[PDB]
Amino acid sequence: EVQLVESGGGLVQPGGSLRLSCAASGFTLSGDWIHWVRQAPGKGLEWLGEISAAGGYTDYADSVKGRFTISADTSKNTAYLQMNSLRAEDTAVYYCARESRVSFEAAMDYWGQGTLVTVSSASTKGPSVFPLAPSSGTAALGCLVKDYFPEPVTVSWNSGALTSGVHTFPAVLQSSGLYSLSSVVTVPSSSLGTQTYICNVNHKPSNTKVDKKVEPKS
């Protein structure tokens, strides 16, 4: 019923600017309170700001004050975070959240999915996708997503119909400066041949959508 959906995230040159959007569904913004919070990949949670949609009053953390502005358009039911003059430190997953209905307290009970902001002077690159074919009980197979930037990459198996034994590994930053991961899944040996296995890789930054079929080799 109630949810936040955030967008606008992606790659940005250091010194540059970006605008994030938090779209609210299932409740009216006027009279509610909206918070932006970020999480740098390694570390913990950091409160950025607060806006009351009705009247448009705002408050910020010292670490972003003057550089960042929160606003909201009550008529489109969407809040915004405008970020200027970005730094490597600003690389993070940004969330918006609504204050809970039940007390003066700044508890946040509904959160968006989160969107990744990456600030660096590097170029967008599409991934290559490679088979990781099985051989010989139970058998393992997968896909290799190689040489992409920036994060993130989305891997699904058979449009999402397969979730048992599916391990998508954290990406690894390589020497070259590109990212790489593997998604893998374990299946019964008897199902080989009669069950097709397709991994569904999506890297929206470069806008690559690739669905590769993994079978054994002659």
Binding site: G44, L45, E46, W47, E50, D59, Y60, A61, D62, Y95, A97, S100, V102, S103, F104, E105, A106, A107, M108, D109, W111, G112, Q113, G114, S128, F130, P131, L132, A133, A140, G142, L144, K146, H167, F169, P170, A171, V172, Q174, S180, L181, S182, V184, T186, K217
Partner: protein, 212 residues
């Protein structure tokens, strides 16, 4: 400004155990504290508000205590699904500062990894690179060793490890290691081996192939 110092940074506990997490404010916050449960790659979920008030639909094994300066989240009977990072937050007044976090991992019976190796695809060799992957599946504890041997030589600084975040149903980990080289360097060797050491193993497990 108001500090929130969390304790500890991380902990392991058995299923059924009592877990206690501590947050500490530098100033009197009275009762204005909130706890959040964040599972990896998911948004934080509100557990507690006003120090001791359970948010609706939250399991009863979570409870909150404390006043003024010293605060406690408690899980009475730890469940596998409870793997996550937990956060205290000062909820009044602005700026609302969050604690550093507490990573909670489940302790579990020991399990030896299942090892797999994967030769590079022919279509990758085309573009002049080779990636050989070794998969260790559904094992516990986390600490494991993947050694690459290439024609029986030990390899150094040419592989990268990536670790699955602990499984939330059976509390296991998975690990991938990737050996990367120039197809010229690949095509000058015969046997590609992957050697694995774990607490569940009393003797190293080797998995290998021969180039074509």
């Amino acid at each position: 400004d108001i500090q929130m110092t969390q304790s500890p940074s991380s902990l392991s506990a058995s299923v059924g155990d009592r877990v206690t997490i501590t947050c500490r404010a530098s100033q009197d916050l009275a009762t204005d504290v909130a706890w959040y449960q964040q599972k990896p790659g998911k948004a934080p979920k509100l557990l507690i508000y006003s120090a001791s008030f359970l948010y609706s639909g939250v399991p009863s094994r979570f409870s909150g205590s404390g006043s003024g300066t010293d605060f406690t989240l408690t899980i009475s009977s730890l469940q596998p699904e409870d793997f996550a990072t937990y956060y205290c937050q000062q909820s009044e007044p602005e700026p609302y500062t969050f604690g550093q976090g507490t990573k909670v991992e489940i302790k579990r019976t020991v399990a030896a990894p299942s090892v797999f190796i994967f030769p590079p695809s022919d279509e990758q060799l085309k573009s002049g690179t080779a990636s050989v992957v070794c998969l260790l599946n559904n094992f516990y504890p986390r600490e494991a060793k993947v050694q690459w041997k290439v024609d029986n030589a030990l390899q150094s600084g040419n592989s990268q490890e990536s670790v699955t975040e602990q499984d939330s149903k059976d509390s296991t980990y998975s690990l991938s290691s990737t050996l990367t080289l120039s197809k010229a360097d690949y095509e000058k060797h015969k046997v590609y081996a992957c050697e694995v050491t774990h607490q569940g193993l009393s003797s190293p497990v080797t998995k290998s192939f021969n180039r074509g």
